[PDB]
């Protein structure tokens, strides 16, 4: 089973997330407060060749590895705030996980 991991830390604050799977990544999307495209507020879209799109809270976005990304956001996030990362990958499909700051 593929696995998505999410780590949220205070630096402004940083969202890091990555995909542990058996295929390459076609797209990464990052959202605030709920699932990507299904309730959450979009923060960033990352494509391996076409680049990065980002929305206001997110100030910086980058690939940390070929399977993981990092976002810097201007804050404010609470311990209860959820951040979700969705990885679209062939052949396994789309996989998402959500995380929050350590209380």
């Amino acid at each position: 089973t593929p696995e998505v991991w999410v780590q949220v830390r205070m630096e402004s604050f940083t969202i890091r997330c990555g995909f542990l799977g058996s295929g390459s990544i076609s797209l990464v999307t990052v959202s605030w407060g709920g699932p990507n495209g299904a309730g959450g507020t979009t923060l960033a879209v990352l494509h391996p060749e076409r680049g990065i799109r980002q929305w206001a809270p997110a100030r910086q976005a980058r690939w940390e590895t070929q399977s993981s990304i990092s976002l810097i956001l201007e804050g404010s996030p609470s311990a209860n705030t959820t951040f979700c990362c969705k990885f679209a990958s062939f052949p396994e499909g789309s996989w998402e996980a959500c995380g929050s700051l350590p209380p």
Binding site: S26, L27, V45, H47, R53, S89, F90, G93, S94, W95
Partner: protein, 126 residues
């Protein structure tokens, strides 16, 4: 700017064949579809992804539960060369030999570049 056109409910007959329509409806210049994924959110995790289509490499059906023997993409086209581009905007699924196991919610999701994840949801009944 873009939305997924699906039917709210699809009704099928046991042993028969049905289609689940899914179109990213407004053709928008500069909008790229990098992947299409069909999921059954009600399923266990290892059975949730039931179909995927890649612009270059075509379809996969990683869950066995409907599985590749009874599921197919009706219209999605992979790119055939450096001349011709993939056509993923019609993600309609066909399901054959319908069984009670196939009933449930199905989500069709486009992984699009500028816009992000765009999805619609259908309920299939048998």
């Amino acid at each position: 700017d873009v939305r997924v056109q699906v039917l709210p409910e699809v009704r099928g007959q046991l042993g028969g064949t049905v289609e689940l329509p899914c179109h990213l409806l407004p053709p928008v210049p500069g909008l790229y579809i990098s992947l299409v994924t069909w999921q059954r959110p009600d399923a266990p995790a290892n059975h949730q992804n039931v179909a995927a289509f890649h612009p270059k490499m075509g379809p996969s059906f990683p869950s066995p539960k409907p599985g590749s023997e009874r599921l197919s993409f009706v219209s999605a086209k992979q790119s055939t060369g450096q001349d011709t581009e993939a056509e993923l905007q019609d993600a309609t699924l066909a399901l054959h030999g319908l069984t009670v196991e196939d009933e449930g919610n199905y989500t069709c999701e486009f992984a699009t570049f500028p816009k992000g994840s765009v999805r619609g949801m259908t309920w299939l009944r048998v």
